[PDB]
Scaffold this active site. Structure first.
Site, PDB file in Angstrom:
ATOM      1  N   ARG A 190      24.770  62.609   9.703  1.00 48.07           N
ATOM      2  CA  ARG A 190      25.443  63.779   9.112  1.00 48.07           C
ATOM      3  C   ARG A 190      26.802  63.452   8.473  1.00 48.07           C
ATOM      4  O   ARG A 190      27.176  64.053   7.470  1.00 48.07           O
ATOM      5  CB  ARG A 190      25.591  64.910  10.149  1.00 48.07           C
ATOM      6  CG  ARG A 190      24.275  65.594  10.496  1.00 48.07           C
ATOM      7  CD  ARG A 190      24.465  66.910  11.228  1.00 48.07           C
ATOM      8  NE  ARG A 190      25.278  66.792  12.438  1.00 48.07           N
ATOM      9  CZ  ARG A 190      24.832  66.411  13.634  1.00 48.07           C
ATOM     10  NH1 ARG A 190      23.558  66.091  13.822  1.00 48.07           N
ATOM     11  NH2 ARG A 190      25.680  66.337  14.653  1.00 48.07           N
TER      12      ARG A 190
ATOM     13  N   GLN B  69      34.106  56.374  27.450  1.00 45.19           N
ATOM     14  CA  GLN B  69      33.911  55.238  28.385  1.00 45.19           C
ATOM     15  C   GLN B  69      32.818  54.215  28.016  1.00 45.19           C
ATOM     16  O   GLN B  69      33.089  53.013  28.040  1.00 45.19           O
ATOM     17  CB  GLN B  69      33.701  55.719  29.841  1.00 45.19           C
ATOM     18  CG  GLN B  69      33.461  54.528  30.819  1.00 45.19           C
ATOM     19  CD  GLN B  69      33.442  54.879  32.296  1.00 45.19           C
ATOM     20  OE1 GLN B  69      33.091  54.038  33.139  1.00 45.19           O
ATOM     21  NE2 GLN B  69      33.823  56.101  32.624  1.00 45.19           N
ATOM     22  N   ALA B  70      31.607  54.682  27.683  1.00 46.01           N
ATOM     23  CA  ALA B  70      30.439  53.790  27.531  1.00 46.01           C
ATOM     24  C   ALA B  70      30.544  52.843  26.324  1.00 46.01           C
ATOM     25  O   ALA B  70      30.411  51.625  26.458  1.00 46.01           O
ATOM     26  CB  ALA B  70      29.147  54.598  27.461  1.00 46.01           C
TER      27      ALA B  70
ATOM     28  N   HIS C 159      34.349  56.330  21.598  1.00 49.88           N
ATOM     29  CA  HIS C 159      35.377  56.982  22.392  1.00 49.88           C
ATOM     30  C   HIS C 159      34.858  57.325  23.784  1.00 49.88           C
ATOM     31  O   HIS C 159      33.657  57.282  24.042  1.00 49.88           O
ATOM     32  CB  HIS C 159      35.932  58.228  21.673  1.00 49.88           C
ATOM     33  CG  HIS C 159      34.885  59.229  21.305  1.00 49.88           C
ATOM     34  ND1 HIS C 159      34.060  59.075  20.212  1.00 49.88           N
ATOM     35  CD2 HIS C 159      34.528  60.398  21.885  1.00 49.88           C
ATOM     36  CE1 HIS C 159      33.229  60.100  20.144  1.00 49.88           C
ATOM     37  NE2 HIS C 159      33.493  60.919  21.147  1.00 49.88           N
TER      38      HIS C 159
ATOM     39  N   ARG D 214      40.160  59.424  15.240  1.00 45.89           N
ATOM     40  CA  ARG D 214      40.497  60.681  14.575  1.00 45.89           C
ATOM     41  C   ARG D 214      42.012  60.806  14.398  1.00 45.89           C
ATOM     42  O   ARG D 214      42.768  60.592  15.348  1.00 45.89           O
ATOM     43  CB  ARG D 214      39.964  61.862  15.400  1.00 45.89           C
ATOM     44  CG  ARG D 214      40.315  63.242  14.859  1.00 45.89           C
ATOM     45  CD  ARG D 214      39.922  64.341  15.847  1.00 45.89           C
ATOM     46  NE  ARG D 214      38.469  64.538  15.909  1.00 45.89           N
ATOM     47  CZ  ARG D 214      37.757  65.258  15.037  1.00 45.89           C
ATOM     48  NH1 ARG D 214      38.348  65.864  14.006  1.00 45.89           N
ATOM     49  NH2 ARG D 214      36.439  65.381  15.195  1.00 45.89           N
TER      50      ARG D 214
ATOM     51  N   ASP E  45      40.375  60.047   8.565  1.00 45.03           N
ATOM     52  CA  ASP E  45      39.609  61.282   8.407  1.00 45.03           C
ATOM     53  C   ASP E  45      38.342  60.941   7.627  1.00 45.03           C
ATOM     54  O   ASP E  45      38.375  60.787   6.404  1.00 45.03           O
ATOM     55  CB  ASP E  45      40.418  62.380   7.690  1.00 45.03           C
ATOM     56  CG  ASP E  45      39.768  63.768   7.808  1.00 45.03           C
ATOM     57  OD1 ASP E  45      38.578  63.856   8.187  1.00 45.03           O
ATOM     58  OD2 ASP E  45      40.452  64.778   7.527  1.00 45.03           O
TER      59      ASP E  45
ATOM     60  N   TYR F 252      26.753  63.132  30.094  1.00 45.05           N
ATOM     61  CA  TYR F 252      27.964  62.478  30.595  1.00 45.05           C
ATOM     62  C   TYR F 252      27.583  61.687  31.851  1.00 45.05           C
ATOM     63  O   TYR F 252      26.480  61.836  32.358  1.00 45.05           O
ATOM     64  CB  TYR F 252      29.017  63.535  30.959  1.00 45.05           C
ATOM     65  CG  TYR F 252      29.716  64.254  29.803  1.00 45.05           C
ATOM     66  CD1 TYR F 252      29.355  64.041  28.469  1.00 45.05           C
ATOM     67  CD2 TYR F 252      30.732  65.184  30.062  1.00 45.05           C
ATOM     68  CE1 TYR F 252      30.000  64.712  27.428  1.00 45.05           C
ATOM     69  CE2 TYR F 252      31.382  65.866  29.024  1.00 45.05           C
ATOM     70  CZ  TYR F 252      31.009  65.623  27.712  1.00 45.05           C
ATOM     71  OH  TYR F 252      31.650  66.277  26.681  1.00 45.05           O
TER      72      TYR F 252
ATOM     73  N   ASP G 262      28.169  55.435  32.417  1.00 46.15           N
ATOM     74  CA  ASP G 262      28.996  55.030  31.285  1.00 46.15           C
ATOM     75  C   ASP G 262      29.164  53.496  31.145  1.00 46.15           C
ATOM     76  O   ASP G 262      28.585  52.909  30.235  1.00 46.15           O
ATOM     77  CB  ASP G 262      30.328  55.792  31.301  1.00 46.15           C
ATOM     78  CG  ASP G 262      30.177  57.272  30.871  1.00 46.15           C
ATOM     79  OD1 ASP G 262      29.039  57.736  30.607  1.00 46.15           O
ATOM     80  OD2 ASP G 262      31.211  57.980  30.789  1.00 46.15           O
TER      81      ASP G 262
END
Lengths: 427, 427
Positions: free
Chosen positions: A103, A16-17, A14, A37, A72, A138, A168
């Site tokens: 995680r 730019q990069a 999500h 999401r 989800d 960023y 990015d």
């Protein structure tokens, strides 16, 4: 046939990069499935929208040639779907924080167990093992981290960010190299690979010339081509001439030539009110005579004060200012053509308006009008690499979860299971 | 195994753009044979040397992992040597002028006849078919051609060049993507392709975000996140106020966020006498409460004037100047550490000196000390992509014609013919 036809990309990315990387893969034929999401999706969708409740230009210009599924991933069912998708993927791409994919239940060790052929590709702020591996980064933070900010701008101004996405989009293109390189590893080994690009490192790679300069500065105490090494050129706040006597890290050199021939950014007609009425003008040694002809200074052709590189070293900024006086009543394209008839390479500052409507860029497929029947058509940048065998076919960016059920059907789920996933808010 | 193990590259490249591409291929395992001009070689060898008659840092930092052969490609014998080398190559890389390789006798058509599998890769100034396709383009001119210069710097200053090689090294990396994509497709087709990247297009790809802004500006008349959107903030040199009322092409926004998420470049302790004593600080909308705690402004959390992007548009630069007052007695590293406690995106302007000596970058192999017992060791930038299965082995740049005879032996030439070619001055 296109290079990435048949390559299944599971795209978690999500902003730019990451999205720039997977979009360019899509332009070369990749089958990109963007996992988003539930409810909101990629935050660029709602970012500075020009149309109410329509996906923004930030989103559409980075997410063409992709499908979209909502998921989800903190649900048990969501994790099970992810496992099925990984088994059908060639490449997984992500830009979550440090340890975030681990995680959510997907270590590199576990991914390898699921699919021994998949390539995991990550965009990071700092490299794994860096003291600052933990820091959020960023666009402009990466420009600062990688040396670009320190060496961009003027000697009497702040560190300055580039309008180009050094952080990015550049990191995205670097990750595409990594992914393609890993595909070639796989042709040899038959197995996948983990690859990662740090934003700091992608910036540093483009700033390689300034690391050359830093070493030269440490070794010799001077950078002869920089404004600060020349008399009658750079001055500080309180009017004192600058010098390398006290400079130990590579400084800002304004619009100086750098690794090329000496150059400077010169005003053309209308500069007071047109911010882009400029040319970049270079003084090549072996053009000196034709420069004198252009600006009608025949006396400078024979004069040893002006005749050679050595002579001009105490007067280069004054020479640029004089050339500039000759452009005062001329347009930037006029000046460029004028220079050209003397064999002198010179170039105008192209405004974004000029670029958005340039016919040549649209002819060669670099600026492309995307047909978007839902949102209205928009321009984008196409593939900057041109190929003898094919061209990209750019198609509109996906609506949020537009392809959820279609993708689920490809995994082999029946209507019953698909409805249950919607019921349980997994998709 | 290394990605490009067993890939043979015939490398005609010189200066920066082409050599960056082939060096990075070398880093990933490619066998790079660099064809150089007799006597002088790649002109970077003699540019801004730090030690008399020692190949410059410009050369060594762009030509590691390469072998060097001297060749007079104008001679009949040199051309037939090229023919033999092409038959053994996977990739030919060049950055000569428009049509120069063609005029040497090596058109794409002829190359295909010599070797159906070989990929021809070129760096150009402008794309084939562009009105400007015949022009030679250098670094800063390419930055001007692609929209970077126009959108970099301040609203009351000139278009500004980036210290990053947006033209040269950037084009080389894009070309590397093109080459690897061609390798990937060759596995399907069994045929080589011609691939080309233009400097203008490489720059425009990174300036994608500014093409979004141009479309937004034309459609709506306002870029709400730009400094000029804050009433009475930005002025021209004559003190005339700037606003979007009279802006029709994307302006320079100083140190504004770009791809962020608003932000600014903020002074830290020592800024008066240290050019790089700054941090970049981002006001991400979702982190306003954390920011308020950090700067001890709890009253700003529930105030509609402060707690949304829209509320802050008219005062954003006043907030930045207030945050900056908190850093007056802290260096950039302590400010970064402080911000990181709150998870706020914020980092230092790293000086080139700081980057050259940073232990973390050397640990992760992004800054590499090259062992060069002929010239003395030097630093370079390594591979910015890190892999699970291999690490680059960087070896020193070749001396001029160091591997000439070695390369000729590989072609199957005997010692008599090798002697003859030296005698004829072909090598």
């Amino acid at each position: 046939t296109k290079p990435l036809d048949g390559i299944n990309v599971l795209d978690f990315t999500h902003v730019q990069a990451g999205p720039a990387c997977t979009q360019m893969m899509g332009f070369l034929g990749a089958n990109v499935i963007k996992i988003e999401r539930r409810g909101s999706g990629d935050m660029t969708r709602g970012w500075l929208q020009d149309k109410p409740n329509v996906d923004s230009l930030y989103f559409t210009m980075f997410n063409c040639n992709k499908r979209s599924i909502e998921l989800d991933m903190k649900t048990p069912e969501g994790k099970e779907l992810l496992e099925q998708m990984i088994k059908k993927a060639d490449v997984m791409v992500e830009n979550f924080g440090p340890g975030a994919l681990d995680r959510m239940g997907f270590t590199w060790e576990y991914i390898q167990e699921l699919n021994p052929r998949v390539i995991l590709a990550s965009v990071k702020g700092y490299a794994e093992g860096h003291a600052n591996e933990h820091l959020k980064v960023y666009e402009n933070v990466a420009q600062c981290s990688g040396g670009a900010a320190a060496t961009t701008g003027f000697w009497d101004g702040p560190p300055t960010v580039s309008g180009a996405a050094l952080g990015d989009s550049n990191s995205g293109m670097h990750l595409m190299i990594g992914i393609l390189a890993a595909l070639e590893i796989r042709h040899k080994t038959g197995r996948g690979q983990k690859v990662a690009v740090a934003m700091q490192d992608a910036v540093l790679n483009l700033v390689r010339i300034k690391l050359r300069d830093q070493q030269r500065l440490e070794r010799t105490g001077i950078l002869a081509e920089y404004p600060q090494a020349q008399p009658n050129f750079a001055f500080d706040r309180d009017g004192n001439p600058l010098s390398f006597d006290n400079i130990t890290s590579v400084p800002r050199g304004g619009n100086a030539g750098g690794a090329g021939q000496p150059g400077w950014m010169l005003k053309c007609k209308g500069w007071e009110t047109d911010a882009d009425s400029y040319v970049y003008f270079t003084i090549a040694a072996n053009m000196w005579p034709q420069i004198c002809d252009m600006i009608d200074k025949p006396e400078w052709k024979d004069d040893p004060a002006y005749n050679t590189f050595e002579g001009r070293v105490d007067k280069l900024m004054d020479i640029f200012s004089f050339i500039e006086t000759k452009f005062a009543d001329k347009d930037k394209f006029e000046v460029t053509e004028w220079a050209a008839q003397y064999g002198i390479p010179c170039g105008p500052v192209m405004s974004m308006k000029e670029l958005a409507h340039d016919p040549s860029l649209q002819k060669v497929g670099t600026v492309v009008e995307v047909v978007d029947e839902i949102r209205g058509n928009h321009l984008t940048v196409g593939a900057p690499f041109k190929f003898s065998g094919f061209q990209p076919e750019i198609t509109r960016a996906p609506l949020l979860g537009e392809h959820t059920d279609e993708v689920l059907k490809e995994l082999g789920l029946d209507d019953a299971k698909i409805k249950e996933l919607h019921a349980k808010q997994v998709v």
